[PDB]
């Protein structure tokens, strides 16, 4: 369960997400990593899955993000697609729907995805030889 290949799928989604910039990636999420580390692994995933769901829900049809050019619109849809795929995997890992996220600090979506990627790669590393 813990060292399941879902970890690789999350890492994969994150790899695409962070190699991708859009009009929208500087917009903010609640910084669940500004906490003092007071949560189980399942709580962490639930928290991350929560803030990302707020983000894609709010920005999928947001005029600042939707794009003027074909390429901008494409990148916007890609981003929302990948966020939903990552979110889906996170919820499957979490095993939890209800986790309050209490941080004030906002970070750009971009910085948040890079942090989550570092934590995911650390989980993968702790799983293998």
Residue numbers in the entry: 1 to 129
Give the authors' words.
We tested the interaction model proposed above by mutating Arg85 of IL-4 and the super-agonistic variants to alanine and measuring the residual binding affinity to IL-4Rα. If Arg85 is really involved in generating the additional stability/interaction, then, owing to cooperativity, mutation of this residue would have a greater effect in the super-agonistic variants (decrease in binding affinity) compared to wild-type IL-4. In contrast, the affinity of the IL-4 variant T13D-R85A is decreased 6.5-fold and its dissociation rate reflects IL-4 wild-type-like binding kinetics. Since the hallmark of the super-agonistic variants was a clearly decreased dissociation rate constant (relative koff (T13D or F82D) = 0.3 – 0.4 koff (IL-4wt)), this confirms the above mechanism by which Arg85 is involved in generating the higher binding affinity. To exclude the possibility that structural changes in addition to the removal of the Arg85 side chain play a role in the changes in binding stability, we determined the structures of the IL-4 variants R85A, T13D-R85A and F82D-R85A.
Interleukin 4 (IL-4) is a pleiotropic cytokine that plays a major regulatory role in the immune system. Signal transduction of IL-4 is mediated by a sequential binding process, initiated first by binding of IL-4 to its high-affinity single membrane spanning receptor chain IL-4Rα. This intermediate ligand receptor complex then recruits one of two possible low-affinity receptor subunits, the common gamma chain (γc) or the IL-13Rα1 chain, into the functional hetero-trimeric complex to initiate signalling. The overall structure of IL-4 comprises the known four-helical bundle in up-up-down-down topology, which like the crystal packing is unaffected by these mutations.
